[PDB]
Amino acid sequence: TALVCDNGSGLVKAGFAGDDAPRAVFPSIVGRPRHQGVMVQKDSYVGDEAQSKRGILTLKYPIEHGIITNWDDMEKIWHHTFYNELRVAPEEHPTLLTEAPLNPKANREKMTQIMFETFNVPAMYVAIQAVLSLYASGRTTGIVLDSGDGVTHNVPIYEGYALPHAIMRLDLAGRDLTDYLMKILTERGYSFVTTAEREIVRDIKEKLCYVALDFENEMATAASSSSLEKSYELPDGQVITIGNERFRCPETLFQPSFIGMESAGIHETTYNSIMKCDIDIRKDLYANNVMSGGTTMYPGIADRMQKEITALAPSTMKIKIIAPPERKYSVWIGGSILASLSTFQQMWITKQEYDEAGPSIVHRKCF
Amino acid sequence: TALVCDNGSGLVKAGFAGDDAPRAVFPSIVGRPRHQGVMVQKDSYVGDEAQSKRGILTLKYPIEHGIITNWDDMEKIWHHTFYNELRVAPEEHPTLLTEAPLNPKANREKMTQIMFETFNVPAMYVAIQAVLSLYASGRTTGIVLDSGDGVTHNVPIYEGYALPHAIMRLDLAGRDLTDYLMKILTERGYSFVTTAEREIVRDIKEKLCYVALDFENEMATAASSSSLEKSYELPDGQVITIGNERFRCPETLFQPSFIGMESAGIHETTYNSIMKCDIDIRKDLYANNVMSGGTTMYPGIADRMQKEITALAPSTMKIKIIAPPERKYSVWIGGSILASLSTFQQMWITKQEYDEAGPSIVHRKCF
Amino acid sequence: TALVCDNGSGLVKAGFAGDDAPRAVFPSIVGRPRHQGVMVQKDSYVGDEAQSKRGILTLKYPIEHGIITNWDDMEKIWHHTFYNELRVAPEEHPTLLTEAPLNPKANREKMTQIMFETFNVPAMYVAIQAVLSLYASGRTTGIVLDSGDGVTHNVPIYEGYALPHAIMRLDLAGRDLTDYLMKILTERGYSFVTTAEREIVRDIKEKLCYVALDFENEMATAASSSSLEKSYELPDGQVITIGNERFRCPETLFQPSFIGMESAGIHETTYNSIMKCDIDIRKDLYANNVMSGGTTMYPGIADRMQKEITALAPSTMKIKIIAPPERKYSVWIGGSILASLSTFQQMWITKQEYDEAGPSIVHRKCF
Amino acid sequence: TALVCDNGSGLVKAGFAGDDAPRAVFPSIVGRPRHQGVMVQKDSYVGDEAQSKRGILTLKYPIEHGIITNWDDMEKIWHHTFYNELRVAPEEHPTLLTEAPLNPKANREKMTQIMFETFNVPAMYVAIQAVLSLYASGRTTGIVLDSGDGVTHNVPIYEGYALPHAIMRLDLAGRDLTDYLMKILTERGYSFVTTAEREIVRDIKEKLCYVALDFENEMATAASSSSLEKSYELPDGQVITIGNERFRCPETLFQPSFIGMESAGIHETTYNSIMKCDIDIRKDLYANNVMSGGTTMYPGIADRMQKEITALAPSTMKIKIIAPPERKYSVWIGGSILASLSTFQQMWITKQEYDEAGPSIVHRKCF
Amino acid sequence: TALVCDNGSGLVKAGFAGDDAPRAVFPSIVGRPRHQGVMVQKDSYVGDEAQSKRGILTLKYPIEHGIITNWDDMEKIWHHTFYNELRVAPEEHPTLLTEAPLNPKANREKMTQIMFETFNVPAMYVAIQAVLSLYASGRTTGIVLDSGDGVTHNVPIYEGYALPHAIMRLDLAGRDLTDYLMKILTERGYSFVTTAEREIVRDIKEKLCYVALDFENEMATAASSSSLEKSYELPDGQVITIGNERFRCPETLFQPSFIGMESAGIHETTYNSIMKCDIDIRKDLYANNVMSGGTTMYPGIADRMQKEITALAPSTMKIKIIAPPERKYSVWIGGSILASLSTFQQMWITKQEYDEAGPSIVHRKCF
Ligand SMILES: Nc1ncnc2c1ncn2[C@@H]1O[C@H](COP(=O)(O)OP(=O)(O)O)[C@@H](O)[C@H]1O
Ligand SMILES: Nc1ncnc2c1ncn2[C@@H]1O[C@H](COP(=O)(O)OP(=O)(O)O)[C@@H](O)[C@H]1O
Ligand SMILES: Nc1ncnc2c1ncn2[C@@H]1O[C@H](COP(=O)(O)OP(=O)(O)O)[C@@H](O)[C@H]1O
Ligand SMILES: Nc1ncnc2c1ncn2[C@@H]1O[C@H](COP(=O)(O)OP(=O)(O)O)[C@@H](O)[C@H]1O
Ligand SMILES: Nc1ncnc2c1ncn2[C@@H]1O[C@H](COP(=O)(O)OP(=O)(O)O)[C@@H](O)[C@H]1O
C-alpha cells in the first residue's frame, strides 16, 4: 500500500492510501532544550512530544512558507513520521508527497534525493496540494483556494486541465496570522514572545477568531458593547479577554496591508485568477470555488468570500463557495484518492528511473 | 563506596552512598575554652563534644549563610567527620559535597582544593542542595524550597532542567529565627546572650514554635487567653513560659520585616520564582512545591504555604505542597541516591583532571 | 511654551521646548519609609530626594518595561516634575509625552486622562521615543535603536515614513542588565539585595562596564591576568574589585540567553528589522543605524554593533553606526525640536477635542 | 508643666520640662537599719538620706540592669521624688519616664499602672533613653552609645528613623565596673564588702579611673614606675594608693572577659550595630557616634573609642565621637526637650485611654 | 621528694608529697613570755610547745584571715616546720604552698622571696586551697566550699576550668566563731579573755558545737528542756554547762549578722556562686558541692547545707553535698596528689627563673 504524507508548514498529515482520514497528525516542529540539565533526556524532540515539553524547549519549524529551510530537521520529522507515528518500513511503500505550486525547484529535488537515498522508498511522487483538494471534492472543474500555515495559493482547473499562468501564490497564511495576533494582543497588555508562547496564541486563534461579514460595521459593534468579548484561560490559569482582535486577525486575509504586505486579499486574488482564465470557463469557476486548508476554517469565511467575490463578479454570475466540513484534511484525502487510482500506478517515480536520471527526474514527471 | 557529606550552616550530615539515612549528624560548631584551666583538656572541641561542654566554651559556626567563613575551623569539622564520626580513610572514597546556589565561587574552589590536597580524596563533586532534594522525592519536576540554618533558596526544575534565572536565594533561615527568638524572649524577662545560651534558644524553637494559619487571628487568641502558652525547663531547672512567641518566631519566614529585611516572605518568593518560569511549566510547578530542610519542619508550615500560594496563584491552579516527614534529611538522602547512580560515575571530578586544571575545574564540571 | 516630558522607565527628562538640554533629570522612583519613626518626615519621597534617603526607604519604579504599573505613584512623579522640578503651572503649557512602541493601549489612554483631568493641560501629545531620536540626529531616514532602562526597540524610518511591521521591541534594557550584574556579583562574594543596593549596582554598571569587541577573546584575557580588573568604593568605604563582570553584564545585550531569554541580541534584532523592510531602502538603513538611550552608552558598543551587523549584512553594504555623544538625551532633544516646529502646532490633542471624544482620541491622533 | 523623671539604675534625674538641668539628682537607693535601735528613726531611708546614714544601713537598689526588681521600693523612690525632692503634686503634671530598650514588657506596664493608680498622673509616656540622648545633641541622625549604671545600649537612628533590628543591649555598665574594682582592690589588701563600702568604691572609680589609649602599653608603664599611682583618703582617714587598677577597671568596657562575660566590648558592639544597618547610612553613623551616660565620663574614653572604631571601619570613613561635657544628663535634657515640643503633646498616654485599655496601652503608644 | 606545706590561719599541715596524711599538724602560733623569769627558757615558743606553755605566754597568730600579718613570726613557724617537725633540709625539696583566693598580691610575693632567699628551696609553687580540695575528692567538676580558721571561700570548677568571676570569699571562719562563742559564753557567767583562754574556747567549740537543722525549732527545744545541755571540764577542774550556745555558735555561718556582718551565709554564698556560672554547668555544680576545712566538721552541717541550698535551687535539681570524713585535711591531701603528678613537674617555679624575674614570677606562673 502507498503512503500519503502531506508535509505542511504547520502540521504533518500522514497515513495510508485508501483510508478516509490521516492516521498521524502532529505539529511539524523540532524542539531542543534551552536550559541546562541537572538530573542525571534527548537531544531534540519532534512533533507532539516537543509540544508537550515546549516550556523548556526552543521550537523550530523546518518548513517556512512551504519551503524546507532546515533539511536536517526535516529528516528528523520524516523519520519520526515513518517509524514512530505510522510505524512502517519506508522501503516497501510508495510515498506520495505534496508541495505548494511555484516553489523553488531544489525543494522537490532534495525531497526526491532524501526519499530515495535516506529512506530508500521504492517509488515516490510529488503532487500539488490544490490539485489534491479537487480530488477530495469529487470535482474535475474548479478554482481551489488552499490556505495552510505557510502558503495561500489559487489553482484554477477546468475539465482536469490546470491553467498554470493563472496560478496565484501568496506567502500569507496561518503562521502570519498567528504572528499578527501576537502583535495586537500587546494592545491589551498580553505579552507572548517565546516560540512556546506562539503555540498558545495559535490555540487562541483557532478557538476565538472569526471572519466578520462587514469589518467596519463589526468594528463599531465591538467599540460600543462587550457582546463580542470572549475569555480564554492560559495554561497557567490566567484568564485573558479579547474583543475586536477576534475578527481583526483573520481580516488580514482580506486586507494584507495590516501586516505591511502590498498584495491583494484572498478574494481579489481569487477573482484575479479567474480573470486570467479564458472567458469561456469563468462561469464554471465562479460556481466552483473550493476552499481547503486550516486557514479556511474560520467561522464566516465562506460567507465573506461569497460576499466579496459577488461584488467583483458580474451580477448575472452565480458565485458558489464550496467549503466542506472536513476541508482541513482535503489535501491528504485527495492524495489518498489519487494514490489509490489504478490510472495513477504508472505515474510513480520508481527507484530504477531515479538511478539513471538523478533527482532531476522529478521535474519531468511531476507537475 | 562514595561518601555523602552535607555541610550545612547548622548541622553536618555525613554517611555512605546507598544508605537511607546519614550515619553522622552533629552540629557544625567549633568550641574553644574561654576560662582558665586550673586542674593539670583540648585546645578546641568539635561537634557533639563542643555541645556537651558548651558551658565553658565559646561556640563558633565556621559556615554562615552557606558560606564558609573560617577555613581552619571548617577543616577541623571535616577532619572530625571523616576520622571520628565515619571512621574512614578519605583517600579511598569519592566525596559528594553540597552547596547552596548563588554562592561565591571561591567557596567551592577552596572546598575542592582542601578535599584534594588536605584529605587527598580520589574524586569529589559539589552538588546544589535543592537539586538533591528533588532526587530524594523521586521527582524530575518541581520547585524546591530548601531552608536550613543559613539559606532559604528556591530552585524550579522541569523535566530535569533547571531554570537558573528563576533561582531565588534568601539569606534568612534557621539561625536568623533563633536570633529573633532570643530578642523577643527578652519581652518576658528571659535573657540569653552567650553562644551557649543561643543553643538553648534553638532547642526551644524546635520544640515549641509553630506556624499560625492566620497570624493576626492567632495574635488575638494569644492575647485573650493562655491556651497557647507552653512551658519549657531550662538546663538549670528554671521553667520559662512563652505564649505568642511560639508563632511570632516562624512568622518571620513570611514577614521578613520582623528582623528588618526588605525581602518578601517565602511564599511570595516561591510565587515570584514560578512567575519567572515559562508559562507552559507553571502548572506543573504549582502542583509540585517540594519543601526540605530543618526550617520547614515547623508544624503548620505546609498548610500556611498552601494557603498563601493559593491566594497568589490563579484560582484554577491546583497548589500542592510536598512536605515529606523525613524532609530534614532530603538533601543527604538525595545525595545518597545521586552518588549511587551508574550514570553519575562519569560526573566525578577526579584527582587526575584536578592536577591539570587546578581548583577551577569545579566550575566547568559542577552546577 | 510647550513642555517636553520624557518619562523613561529609569529617569524623568523634563524641560521646555526650544531648549537644547532637559532642565530636570531625576530618577523615576517613589520611596516610602520601611522603618519606624522615633523622632517627633513625609509619607513618601520622589526622585532625587528618595535617592538620597534610600537607606531607610523601599524604592519603587512606577514604570516597568515602558509600562506604567502604578498610576498613583506615577501621578506623584508627574506632580513632582511640574511643581517642584520645572516649577510651572501645567494648565498653561502643552505637554509632549513619550512612549515606547507596541505598548498597551490603556497606557497612553490613562496618560491622556490624567493630563487632561488631573493636571488640566491645554493640549498634549504622545510621541514614539525612537521617532524623536531621529529628529535629534537631524535625519529623515534611518533605523533607530533606542535602549533605555525598560525597553530596547528598533524603528526603521525612510524619508519620514515608518515601517510599522518592521518595528521590533525587546523587553530587555538597563534594568535587566542591573539585575544580572547583581546576580553575577555574588560570584565574588558581594551581596546586593535591597532596592537601595540595586541603585549602587546601577552606579557600578555605569562606571565600570564596557562592551568587549570579541567576547570569547576578552574572557581569555580576563582569565590570564588582572589587567581588566578595576576597583570601586562602596558608600560605606568598602572597596570591591570586578574583572570579567565588567563586560559580561553588557554582553547580555548581544546574548540574551545569559538571563534566560530566547530572543536574539540587539545586533540580530536590528538586522531582522532591516530585512523586514523593502529591499530598495535597506542600503540607506544600513548606513544610518542611529543609537540612542542610556543603555547605548557603554564604551565599545558602537564598534561591537558595527562588527556584528557587518558580519550579517552583505559585504558590499556600508554599515555605519551613528552614536552621538549626547545620545542619552536624544529622545528629549528630539521632542524639544518636534514641539517647536510650526508644522506640529496642528498635531496637538486639545482639551476641546478631548471633551467630545474621551481619552480614546489619543489613538487616532498619535502614532 | 510636664515632669521628666529619668529613673536610672544608679541615679534618679528628675525635673520640669523646659529646664536645662535636672532639679533633683540623688541615688536610687533604699536603706534599712541593720542594727538595733537603743535610743528612744525611720523604717527606711531613700536617696541622699540613705547615703549619709549608710554606715548603719543595708543599701538596696530597686533597679538592676534597667529592670525594676523591687516594686515596693521603687514606689518609695518615686514618692520621695515627687513629694520630697520636686515638692509637687503628681495629679496635675504629665510625667515622662525613660527606659532602656529590649526591657521586659511587664516593666513598663507596671510603671504605667503605678503612675495612673498610685500617683494618679493625668498622662504619662515612656521613652527610650538613647533616643532622648539624640534630642539633647540637637541631631536627627546618629548611633547613640548610652551607658549608665545598669545597661549599655546602642541605638542607630537615621533621619529620625530607628533601626530596631540593629539595637544592641549589653548588661554591663557602671555597677559591674564598681563590683570589678572592688574585686581587684583586694590585690592591694583593701577589703570592701558591705553595700555601704560599695558606695566608697564607686566614688574611687569616679575620681581616679581613666581609660588607657593603649592598654598593654599602659600596663608596662604602671609596672615600671609609680607615675600612675594616686592616693585616695577613705572616710575614716585611711589613705589607699592604686596604680594600674585606675585603668584596668574601665578596660572591662572594652574587654568584658575581665568579668567573665562572652560579649564583645563597646567598640565592637558599636561597630556591629553600624554593620547591621543599611550600607547607605553607615557613613553618617560613623561620623555621629554620640556618647551619653555616666559610664562614658571616664577621661580618655572618647579617644579610645575613636581609635578602636577607626581600626574596625574602612580607612576612608571619618570616625567622629560626639562626647558632650554634659553627657551625664543627656537623657534628662533630651526628655526635657521632647516633653516641651508642641508636636509631642498628642503622644501622651492620657488617663482616659488608660481606663479603656488597661496598662497594655503603653505598648501601642510608646517605642 | 616534694614538700607540701598547708599554712592555714589556724594549723600548719606539713608533710611529703605522695603520703596520704600530713606528717606534722600543729597550731600556727608563736608564744612569748608575759611574766618575769626568776629561776636561772626561750625567747619565744612555736606550735605545740607554745600550746603546752600557754599559761605563761601571750599567743599570737601570724596569719589572720589567710593573710600573713607578721612575717618575722611566720618565718619562725616555717623554720619550726622544716627543721623541727619534718626534720628536713629545705634546700633539696621543692615546696608546694597554699593560699586562699583573692589574697593580696604581696602575700604570695613575700612567700616566694622567703622560700628562695631564706630557706633556699630549689623550687616552689603556690596553689589555691579550694582547687587542691577538688584533687583530694578525685573530681574535676564541682563547687568547693573550703572553710578553715581564717577564710571561707567558694571556687566553682567545671571540667578542670575555674570560673574566677564566680569565686566568692568570706572573711568569716573558725576564728570568728571562736570569738563569738567566747562572747555568748559570758551569758552564763563564764569569762574567757586571754589568748590562752581563747584556745580553751576553741576546744569547747570543736567538742560540743553542732549545726541545727532548724534553728528556730532548736531554740524552742533548748528553752523548754535541758536535753541539749552538755558539760565540759576546764583544765583547772571547773565544769561548765552550755545549752543553746552549742548550735548558736555555728549558726553564725548561716546568719553572719550574729557577729555584725552584712554578708550572706555560706548557703546563699554557695548559691550565688553557682548562679554566677554559665547556665549549662549549674546542674553539675548543684550535684557536686564539695566541703573541706575544719569549719565544715560540725555535726549536721552537710544536712543543713543540703536543706538550705535545696530551698534556693529549682525543685528539679539534685543537690548533693560531698562531705568526706577526712575533709579536714583535704587541702593537704590534694596538694600531696598535685605535687606527685608527672604533669605538674613542669609547673614548679625554679630558682633559676626566680633569679631572672624576681618575686613577681609567682603571678604569671601560679593561679
Ligand atoms: N479552527 C481553525 N480556525 C482558524 N485557523 C485554524 C483552525 N484550525 C487550524 N487552523 C490553522 O491552519 C493552519 C495549518 O493548517 P493546515 O491546513 O494543516 O496547514 P499545513 O498543511 O500548512 O499544516 C495553522 O496555522 C492553524 O493555525
Ligand atoms: N522541628 C523543628 N522545628 C523548627 N526548626 C527546626 C526543627 N528541627 C530543626 N530545625 C532547624 O533547622 C535548622 C537546620 O536544619 P538543616 O536542614 O540541617 O539545615 P543545615 O543543613 O543548614 O544544617 C536549624 O536552625 C534548626 O533550628
Ligand atoms: N554610562 C552608562 N553606561 C551604561 N549604562 C548607562 C550609562 N548611563 C546610563 N545608563 C543606563 O541607561 C538606563 C536609562 O537611561 P535612559 O536612556 O534615560 O532610559 P530611560 O528613558 O528608560 O530612563 C539606566 O538603566 C542606566 O543604568
Ligand atoms: N566621672 C565619672 N567617671 C566614671 N564613671 C562615672 C562618673 N560619674 C558617674 N559615673 C558612673 O555612671 C553611673 C551612672 O550614671 P548615669 O548615667 O546617671 O546612669 P543611671 O541613669 O543608670 O543612673 C554610675 O555607676 C557612676 O559610677
Ligand atoms: N570537729 C570540729 N568542729 C568544729 N570546728 C572544728 C573542728 N575541728 C577543727 N575545727 C576548726 O577548724 C578551724 C581550722 O581548721 P583547718 O581546716 O585546719 O583551717 P586552717 O587551714 O585555717 O588551719 C579551727 O578554727 C578549728 O576550730
Ligand SMILES: [Ca+2]
Ligand atoms: Ca497544506
Ligand SMILES: [Ca+2]
Ligand atoms: Ca542544608
Ligand SMILES: [Ca+2]
Ligand atoms: Ca527612554
Ligand SMILES: [Ca+2]
Ligand atoms: Ca540612664
Ligand SMILES: [Ca+2]
Ligand atoms: Ca586552710
